[PDB]
From a paper:
A crystal structure of the SepCysE-SepCysS-tRNACys ternary complex was determined at a resolution of 2.6 Å by a molecular replacement method. A dimer of the N-terminal domain of SepCysE [SepCysE(NTD), residues 35–101] was tightly bound to a dimer of SepCysS, with their twofold axes aligned. From one of the NTDs of the SepCysE dimer, a linker chain (residues 102–110) extended to the C-terminal domain of SepCysE [SepCysE(CTD), residues 111–213] to which tRNACys was bound with its CCA terminus in contact with SepCysS. The SepCysE(CTD) of the second subunit was not visible in the crystal, probably because of the absence of bound tRNACys. SepCysE(CTD) was bound to the elbow region of tRNACys mainly via van der Waals and ionic interactions. Since most of the interactions of SepCysE(CTD) with tRNACys are with the phosphate backbone, SepCysE(CTD) is likely to be a non-specific tRNA binding domain. PLP was covalently bound to the side chain of the conserved Lys234 located deep in the cleft at the dimer interface. Second, a helix-loop-helix-loop region (Pro333–Glu368) at the tip of the small domain held the acceptor stem of tRNACys via hydrogen bonds and electrostatic interactions. Although most of the interactions were nonspecific between the basic side chains of SepCysS and the phosphate ions of tRNACys, the discriminator base U73 was strongly recognized by the residues Arg345, Gly346, Phe347 and Gly364; the side chain of Arg345 interacted with the phosphate moiety of U73, and Gly346 and Gly364 together created room exclusively for U73 by specifically interacting with the uracil, and allowing the phenyl ring of Phe347 to stack with U73 and the G1-C72 base pair. The ternary complex SepCysE-SepCysS-tRNACys solved in the present work presents the structure of which the 3′-end moiety of tRNACys is at the active site for the second reaction, while SepRS-tRNA complex solved previously shows the structure for the first reaction.
Author numbering:
A (entry chain F): 34 to 210
B (entry chain E): 34 to 101
C (entry chain I): 16 to 61, 76 to 396
D (entry chain J): 13 to 65, 73 to 396
The structure:
RNA sequence: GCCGGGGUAGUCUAGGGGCUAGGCAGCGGACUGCAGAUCCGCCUUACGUGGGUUCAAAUCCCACCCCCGGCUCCA
């Protein structure tokens, strides 16, 4: 990759600001870990996460000037279950014909009891819970995929992971983001 | 490349400094090319040169946490 | 305490980068990258580099002494307070900045205005009228504490021959304060050439620094009253309140200083931008107010064609604000169509053309 | 190609300092460290003025009312610091020649601002000098009466809520109650308290409160807050006559640019950190208890109810007189271990604060000092 | 720019944390050509955008954009 190969294009200012903000956030580590700035495994993950997310935003900027980047990798045939629809939305813009479903929260309901607050709000959630567990079918039932991944963005998603494939096999996370 | 692979290491302070200085230098283009921020071939090379050099400094930082 | 803090979490949205700002007060306060790097080094805090900087400002303005301030208006009040006895008269032009009146009132001083050589359309100041006003006041028994000239006014952007008022003040034995806001950091200034006893400057208006900072330059003659120290704390200067200037504004001021010294040598290029804007916009029916040709970048236009459009547009006078906003241009007050003020100082020539063509396309599309 | 008449490249020695290579122990510095929210705000607002159009959105109006509730005062105004806030009330409330009654621990700016407002000053003395140097708050009455009996007028009562030499907290309510029935305006200097610990202006019956943004509200210098009751609004917010909107004591200023932006940006971080003031005291008391083991004597009121610590350090003298660095040794030994904020050459006393530091940084500093006085005989 | 109304699928209108809104000159298919009823999917990622809160947001929070009304001629 050479700057000399750069071609006329537009600066994405919103992408540039996200980049510079990320370094500004990362600047706290130079304060909070002064003078030695030695990081442990958890601090290293948190810090490098910032640097890496910044380099991605920089890469989106460079893409506007002819440079090309290989954009993760995604099997577009598999089904992808997800709790948030911010994640759902994000998946559908990175890849529209990519097929995903939104359970809108934790699925099972003593799975829901695992997070808290009792409780015939639950069998009030009677339809819902299974409405996610109905609709998941209406997608799998006819396209029915080879295998079915569940995206994980935090630890409570892997609980949804376990129930989803008590029923139907396969896990993922971060690798497509 | 995943942040989850990050290993204990030291932050190269100067290398971080150079990185953010370069984005500061690049920040000029957001002013001077406002509002449409459309760059020509000369401006593109000058600008992307800054961005890329920033990324090389960032990679050197990531090198100290087990990344290659 | 039952208050929503969410309003303060996204101040991360001032639009200096996605809009061209034509507002005169901000054109010369745009930070160079050398200053931005300095800010990164001193977000929080860090004085010999300051003292050397003051020596440099003294030379750059060709003056004996200099002190840091929180802006031009603070510098005015410092002089009025430390030099004039309460009740004294300050003599200033009618194009004076409101802060001159306010600093005087705060120093509980009296104010007399020097009037216009001509009003519409140039609104020039009768500088020799300073002798008259002084005479008429001294004849009435009132004593004049201070002579004040706003080197360039913030309403029309007229330049004034400060040396004329300087000579007047010298032969009537009265201290002369030159308000070099809108001037120091834009055009070269020689304080003793204009025989000024004092110079105030706005770091954030014309010296590419972050607000609020400024300079007060003065002669050795008045140094004792300006830099007078507290009786209890002899190191601390009373009028400075002990400051001890720290924080980002003084850092940006110092870091921008070489860029400022450079850009006053290229002041003519900015005038060339300014005169280009005048000539071009006059073709569509704008009329430049103030002295002609411009010897400052602050342009005030009489804009009858804009006001006529306003009377037929659903948006009324605010149509012009919207139309500029659609094309990434701001810094001109919303809803005002009879007059507009604007500067293209520091903009790239390409940005200057863009502004002119945008305005031309506004008036043509909007009849 | 420089335009030579004088040096200009000495100015780019500003381009890189040592701000992130050291722990700064300077107490005036600890409460002014910028949080990332504020740094982002700086990036958005470098340039000159920040006025989209004094009732502003940029929510300055909303901020001023929120900062008022936060202090439980009627009104508030932005200032260039606690200095200017004092001078303002001294200039707009007192008449010239009046006496300002203040504690003997008062910050020099209280004296300098009084002299600038052409006011006289009387000091309320200690309930005990060495080593606590605690103010006799009840002594405010005797001084006032002493002055009223001599025909002198007292325009203002001033209490340094926490002094900057010893970091002693003071029961502001008592001086407030003295001021109430003796009918004299009360200004509480909340430099070093507002933004660290919670402060209720009405409960301490304060008429005025000055706050320092850069000292204790995680903002850039110079900024601050003047809070005041509706009773004194007319004189503080008195307007220019030629210009009915512009307030005279502000110099009409759209109190401008960067520092006020950082103050608004750091505000949520500040509100949350005063709720955790006890955790910073814990860090503080850990330092005191620990450095006493090697011969540092905490001065001032024990135990610390503030993070500013002043140690009497005889052992540092004992070492200075025998080392070739001769009193600079401590400063050099600290920099060698990435620590600063202590004045060079001083060994009889030191002032420090670990406010805002991570606990790991706190341990580091303590161990550092111990190993200094250990290695240096 | 300020004060109000608003933006929900090719557009029409509800809902104010979770009950998978529903009606058409919109288009294919469920014998053929004319006329009306159902199944459907249909452009399907329905909620103007970006953040935030939550296990879960059209719904609550912050900021910004556009459409409709209105109001302003310097400090």
């Amino acid at each position: 990759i050479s700057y000399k190969d750069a071609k006329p294009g537009k600066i994405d200012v919103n992408e540039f600001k996200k980049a510079i903000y990320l370094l500004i956030e990362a600047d706290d580590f130079l304060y909070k870990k002064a003078p030695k700035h030695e990081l442990n495994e958890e601090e290293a993950k948190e810090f490098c996460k910032l640097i890496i997310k910044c380099q991605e935003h920089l890469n989106k900027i460079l893409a506007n000037f002819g440079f090309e980047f290989e954009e993760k990798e995604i099997d577009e045939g598999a089904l992808y279950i997800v709790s948030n629809k911010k994640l759902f939305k994000k998946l559908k813009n990175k890849n529209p014909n990519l097929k995903v479903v939104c359970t809108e929260g934790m699925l099972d309901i003593e799975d829901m009891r695992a997070i808290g607050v009792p409780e015939k709000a639950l069998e009030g959630l009677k339809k819902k819970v299974e409405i996610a567990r109905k609709n998941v079918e209406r997608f799998i039932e006819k396209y029915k995929p080879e295998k079915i991944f569940v995206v994980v963005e935090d630890d409570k998603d892997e609980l949804l992971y376990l129930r989803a494939k008590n029923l139907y096999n396969a896990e993922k996370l971060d690798a497509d983001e | 490349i995943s942040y989850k692979d990050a290993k204990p290491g030291k932050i190269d302070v100067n290398e971080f400094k150079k990185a953010i200085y370069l984005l500061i230098e690049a920040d000029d283009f957001l002013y001077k090319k406002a509002p449409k921020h459309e760059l020509n071939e000369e401006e593109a090379k000058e600008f992307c040169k800054l961005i890329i050099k920033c990324q090389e400094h960032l990679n050197k930082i990531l090198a100290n946490f087990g990344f290659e | 305490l039952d208050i929503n803090l969410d309003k303060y979490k996204n101040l991360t949205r001032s639009l200096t980068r996605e809009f061209i700002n034509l507002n005169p007060i901000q054109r010369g306060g745009i930070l160079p990258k050398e200053a931005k790097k300095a800010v990164y080094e001193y977000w929080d805090g860090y004085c010999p580099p300051i003292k050397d900087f003051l020596e440099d400002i003294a030379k750059f303005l060709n003056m004996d002494c200099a002190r840091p301030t929180h802006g031009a208006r603070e510098g005015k009040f410092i002089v009025m307070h430390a030099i004039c006895k309460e009740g004294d008269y300050v003599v200033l032009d009618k194009n004076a900045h409101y802060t001159s009146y306010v600093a005087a009132e705060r120093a509980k001083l009296n104010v007399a205005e020097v009037g216009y050589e001509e009003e519409y359309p140039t609104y020039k100041i009768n500088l020799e009228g300073y002798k008259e006003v002084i005479d008429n006041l001294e004849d009435k028994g009132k004593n004049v504490g201070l002579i004040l000239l706003t080197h360039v006014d913030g309403e029309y952007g007229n330049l004034n021959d400060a040396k004329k008022v300087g000579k007047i003040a010298k032969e009537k034995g009265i201290p002369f304060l030159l308000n070099c806001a809108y001037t120091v950091g834009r055009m070269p200034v020689n304080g003793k050439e204009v025989k000024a006893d004092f110079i105030v400057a706005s770091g954030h208006k014309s010296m590419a620094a972050s607000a609020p900072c400024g300079i007060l330059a003065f002669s050795e003659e008045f140094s004792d009253k300006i830099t007078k120290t507290s009786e209890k704390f002899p190191v601390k200067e009373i009028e400075m309140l002990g400051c001890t200037s720290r924080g980002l504004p003084i850092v940006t001021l110092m870091a921008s200083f070489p860029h400022v010294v450079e850009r006053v040598k290229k002041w003519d290029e900015e005038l060339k931008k300014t005169r280009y804007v005048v000539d071009e916009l006059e073709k569509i029916g704008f009329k430049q107010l103030g002295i002609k040709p411009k010897e400052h970048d602050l342009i005030k236009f009489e804009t009858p064609v804009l006001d006529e459009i306003a009377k037929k547009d659903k948006r009324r006078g605010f149509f012009f604000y919207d139309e500029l906003k659609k094309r990434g241009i701001g810094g001109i007050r919303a809803g005002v169509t009879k007059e507009i003020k604007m500067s293209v100082y520091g903009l790239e020539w390409e940005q200057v053309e863009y502004v002119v063509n945008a305005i031309k396309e506004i008036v043509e599309s909007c009849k």
